[PDB]
Design an enzyme around this catalytic site. Structure first.
Site, PDB file in Angstrom:
ATOM      1  CD  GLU A 192       4.727  11.990   0.542  1.00  0.00           C
ATOM      2  OE1 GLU A 192       4.275  12.785  -0.307  1.00  0.00           O
ATOM      3  OE2 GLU A 192       4.563  10.754   0.472  1.00  0.00           O
TER       4      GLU A 192
ATOM      5  NE  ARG B  73      -2.801   6.409  -3.993  1.00  0.00           N
ATOM      6  CZ  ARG B  73      -1.725   6.583  -3.217  1.00  0.00           C
ATOM      7  NH1 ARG B  73      -0.933   7.649  -3.375  1.00  0.00           N
ATOM      8  NH2 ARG B  73      -1.388   5.661  -2.344  1.00  0.00           N
TER       9      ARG B  73
ATOM     10  CG  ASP C 288       5.204   7.212  -4.817  1.00  0.00           C
ATOM     11  OD1 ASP C 288       4.337   8.086  -4.871  1.00  0.00           O
ATOM     12  OD2 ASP C 288       5.708   6.825  -3.703  1.00  0.00           O
TER      13      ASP C 288
ATOM     14  NE  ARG D 160       2.341   5.375  -3.583  1.00  0.00           N
ATOM     15  CZ  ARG D 160       3.435   4.625  -3.339  1.00  0.00           C
ATOM     16  NH1 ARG D 160       3.964   3.883  -4.285  1.00  0.00           N
ATOM     17  NH2 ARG D 160       3.998   4.674  -2.122  1.00  0.00           N
TER      18      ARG D 160
ATOM     19  CG  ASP E 288       7.224   5.319   0.443  1.00  0.00           C
ATOM     20  OD1 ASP E 288       6.338   6.037  -0.087  1.00  0.00           O
ATOM     21  OD2 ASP E 288       7.606   5.454   1.594  1.00  0.00           O
ATOM     22  CB  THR E 289       9.211   8.519  -4.207  1.00  0.00           C
ATOM     23  OG1 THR E 289       7.798   8.768  -4.325  1.00  0.00           O
ATOM     24  CG2 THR E 289       9.726   7.684  -5.378  1.00  0.00           C
TER      25      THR E 289
HETATM   26  C1  LIG Z   1       1.833   1.007  -3.077  1.00  0.00           C
HETATM   27  C2  LIG Z   1       0.586   0.742  -2.281  1.00  0.00           C
HETATM   28  C3  LIG Z   1       0.047   1.741  -1.457  1.00  0.00           C
HETATM   29  N1  LIG Z   1      -1.089   1.540  -0.756  1.00  0.00           N
HETATM   30  C4  LIG Z   1      -1.655   2.571   0.124  1.00  0.00           C
HETATM   31  C5  LIG Z   1      -1.290   2.341   1.591  1.00  0.00           C
HETATM   32  C6  LIG Z   1      -0.944   3.707   2.170  1.00  0.00           C
HETATM   33  O1  LIG Z   1      -2.119   4.223   2.825  1.00  0.00           O
HETATM   34  P1  LIG Z   1      -2.191   4.334   4.388  1.00  0.00           P
HETATM   35  O2  LIG Z   1      -0.995   4.883   4.994  1.00  0.00           O
HETATM   36  O3  LIG Z   1      -3.536   4.952   4.682  1.00  0.00           O
HETATM   37  O4  LIG Z   1      -2.328   2.815   4.555  1.00  0.00           O
HETATM   38  C7  LIG Z   1      -0.729   4.592   0.960  1.00  0.00           C
HETATM   39  C8  LIG Z   1       0.694   5.090   0.791  1.00  0.00           C
HETATM   40  O5  LIG Z   1       0.684   6.016  -0.288  1.00  0.00           O
HETATM   41  P2  LIG Z   1       1.675   7.199  -0.482  1.00  0.00           P
HETATM   42  O6  LIG Z   1       3.031   6.604  -0.292  1.00  0.00           O
HETATM   43  O7  LIG Z   1       1.389   7.622  -1.881  1.00  0.00           O
HETATM   44  O8  LIG Z   1       1.339   8.285   0.544  1.00  0.00           O
HETATM   45  O9  LIG Z   1      -1.103   3.818  -0.181  1.00  0.00           O
HETATM   46  C9  LIG Z   1      -1.775   0.357  -0.885  1.00  0.00           C
HETATM   47  O10 LIG Z   1      -2.843   0.205  -0.213  1.00  0.00           O
HETATM   48  N2  LIG Z   1      -1.277  -0.645  -1.651  1.00  0.00           N
HETATM   49  C10 LIG Z   1      -0.151  -0.510  -2.379  1.00  0.00           C
HETATM   50  O11 LIG Z   1       0.261  -1.473  -3.047  1.00  0.00           O
HETATM   51 CA   LIG Z   2       5.437   8.250  -1.214  1.00  0.00          CA
END
Ligand SMILES: Cc1cn([C@H]2C[C@H](OP(=O)(O)O)[C@@H](COP(=O)(O)O)O2)c(=O)[nH]c1=O
Ligand SMILES: [Ca+2]
Length: 129
Positions: free
Chosen positions: A37, A75, A15, A29, A34-35
């Site tokens: 890990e 991102r 993702d 992102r 959510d994919t």
């Molecule tokens: C998709 C998305 C992720 N995020 C942030 C929240 C998560 O961080 P925290 O857990 O610190 O809050 C993280 C998840 O990313 P990954 O799934 O890439 O790890 O990306 C946003 O803030 N807004 C969004 O719309």
């Molecule tokens: Ca993910």
């Protein structure tokens, strides 16, 4: 919403994709998904699925929603299309991602994606197996 051109630099995992957007490199992102890990079940599968856009597609586009365009990690936050197909939707439809991170303000394609997830669930596909 509207689609804007960009150029694929590298698909990173299921993702996250690095794009040249208005001439600058940005890691995007994918909105509403959510994919797993890479170290979890179906992580490698989602990673290869999205990576496959380099070989399998020709035209990449980004579409921001109406809210935040960047997350707290720097991102970009967008819907990504490959030859017109939304990657966000495709991942959910194949049971390689779950609908997730849904915020009012950036949830234009929420119902669309939940429909896809319900099909993937009924079929017991991948994550849902
Ligand atoms: C998709 C998305 C992720 N995020 C942030 C929240 C998560 O961080 P925290 O857990 O610190 O809050 C993280 C998840 O990313 P990954 O799934 O890439 O790890 O990306 C946003 O803030 N807004 C969004 O719309
Ligand atoms: Ca993910």
């Amino acid at each position: 919403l509207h689609k804007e051109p960009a150029t694929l630099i590298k698909a990173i995992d299921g993702d996250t994709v690095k794009l040249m957007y208005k001439g600058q490199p940005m890691t995007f992102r994918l909105l509403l998904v959510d994919t797993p890990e890479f170290n979890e079940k179906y992580g490698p599968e989602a990673s290869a699925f999205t990576k496959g856009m380099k070989g399998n597609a020709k035209k990449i586009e980004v579409e921001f929603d109406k809210g935040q365009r960047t997350d707290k990690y720097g991102r970009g936050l967008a819907y990504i299309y490959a030859d017109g197909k939304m990657v966000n939707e495709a991942l959910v439809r194949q049971g390689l991602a779950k609908v997730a991170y849904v915020y009012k303000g950036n949830n234009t394609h929420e119902q669309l994606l939940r429909k896809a997830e319900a099909q993937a669930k009924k079929e017991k596909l991948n994550i849902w197996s």
